[PDB]
Amino acid sequence: MVQRGSKVRILRPESYWFQDVGTVASVDQSGIKYPVIVRFEKVNYSGINTNNFAEDELVEVEAPKAKPKK
Template sequence: MINKGSKVKVLRKESYWYQDVGTVVKVEKDIKYPVFVRFVKETYSGVNSNSFAENELILVQ
């Protein structure tokens, strides 16, 4: 189960953070991409977070 504060690895191939590890900031319900993840690495436009579906993430210890 993915909860707030969990470390997760991104499996979405078209994501800028593919195979990177981030920290879960928020988990919502009843929306398409309920897991909000923040990363250390920023995109070229300065964004360091994104929302993902639970099946696009894997829990890391």
């Protein structure tokens, strides 16, 4: 469950942006191959910077955060 504008890594060895922390732009709830759309700053062999990945192919790699309670 990532958020619109979070930082998760890509687990798609086939994707040019594998092992990279892309940012989530939005999710498409309807029925496609990758509900979550991930943006990228780098490009691939062709020249793109916006692909689609599934929430299962994204890990949350955020830094430490303070939570409620002690």
